[PDB]
Design a protein around this ligand. Structure first.
Ligand SMILES: Cc1cc2nc(CCc3nc4ncccn4n3)cc(O)n2n1
Ligand SMILES: [Mg+2]
Ligand SMILES: [Zn+2]
Length: 322
């Protein structure tokens, strides 16, 4: 387990967000990419707007953010950038649905998005279980997710990192509950059933936000919506994040090929020219239904759906040669 230096986190308190970014950041399609220096600062900003400059000890929060950064590997997609990008989507979702979630959920969810893909190796769940890592020998299903959460718990229990320490012991244990499901929910495998359920519940109108496991479901769906929001950005941003996703996929594939194994088309750099078709497949079978269902449960979230539709037709053009 790994911690941060005093220098780094003290550099975090001085930071103040450049005034031009205040309007732009509220936008769902906002892109954090041109502002690396500022990524940990932006998180702070978003928590500060989300629930005040005193929902957390300032000093104690900066420690955490920077340790979390320390525990993102220098991988091309599942890295510090994806952590924050995801966190920003959740921020915008909470900001647009002001009175739907409890203070506890709000903090809970922003913290879970930041740690969602913690200490990620660049390897899929399939890959680790398939052959035949110690991380898959501990956690059988949702292999990388459990690690992600475990990493999270550990960082919290470090020396004065425990941003949740002031709370009651039942609020503490409970925000951790909220955090856990959320992260686990980022396992794309689990998304399909979950969404299917919510779709049914909404159709019959049995969906109840007073129901605890309905909440958990809705939140899951929100996490998924957040994990995937490269697709919700402006086309030129979506393109480049696309290049980061495949770099990681193909390296995984390259490990399958180093042992004679055909990696499935997604992970196969020999299957480059099939990428646009892949994206369209993915928007249709995954992205669109995610945002469609979510927009339905939470109308204010619509701009995400709009932007997904926009990009999907761009891939079309790409495929059709234009
Ligand atoms: C933002 C984003 C894009 C994306 N694309 C994928 C894979 C989609 C895909 N491409 C393929 N190419 C060839 C064969 C199959 N596929 N399937 C998985 C993701 O998590 N994301 N996230
Ligand atoms: Mg994950
Ligand atoms: Zn993720």
């Amino acid at each position: 387990m790994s911690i941060c230096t005093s220098e780094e986190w003290q550099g975090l308190m001085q930071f103040t967000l450049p005034v031009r970014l205040c309007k732009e950041i509220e936008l769902f399609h906002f892109d954090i990419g041109p502002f690396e220096n500022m990524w940990p600062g932006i998180f702070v900003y978003m928590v500060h707007r989300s629930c005040g400059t005193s929902c957390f000890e300032l000093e104690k929060l900066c420690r955490f953010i920077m340790s979390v950064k320390k525990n993102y590997r220098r991988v091309p997609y599942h890295n510090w950038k994806h952590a924050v990008t995801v966190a920003h989507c959740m921020y915008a979702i909470l900001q647009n649905n002001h009175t739907l979630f409890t203070d506890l959920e709000r903090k809970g969810l922003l913290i879970a998005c930041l740690c969602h893909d913690l200490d990620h190796r660049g390897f899929s769940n399939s890959y680790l279980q398939k052959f035949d890592h110690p991380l898959a020998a501990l956690y059988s299903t949702s292999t990388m997710e459990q690690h992600h959460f475990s990493q999270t718990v550990s960082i919290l229990q470090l020396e004065g990192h425990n941003i949740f320490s002031t709370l009651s012991s039942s609020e503490y244990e409970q925000v951790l509950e909220i955090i856990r499901k959320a992260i686990i929910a980022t396992d794309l495998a689990l998304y399909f059933g979950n969404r299917k359920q919510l779709e049914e519940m909404y159709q019959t109108g049995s969906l109840n936000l007073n129901n605890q496991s309905h909440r958990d479901r809705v939140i899951g769906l929100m996490m998924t919506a957040c994990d995937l929001c490269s697709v919700t950005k402006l086309w030129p941003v979506t393109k480049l994040t696309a290049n980061d996703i495949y770099a990681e996929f193909w390296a995984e594939g390259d490990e399958m090929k180093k042992l004679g194994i055909q990696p499935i088309p997604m992970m196969d750099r020999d299957k480059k020219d099939e990428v646009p078709q892949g994206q369209l497949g993915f928007y249709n079978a995954v992205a669109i239904p995610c945002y469609t269902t979510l927009t339905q449960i939470l109308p204010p979230t619509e701009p995400l759906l709009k932007a997904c539709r926009d990009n999907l037709s761009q891939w079309e053009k790409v495929i059709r040669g234009e």
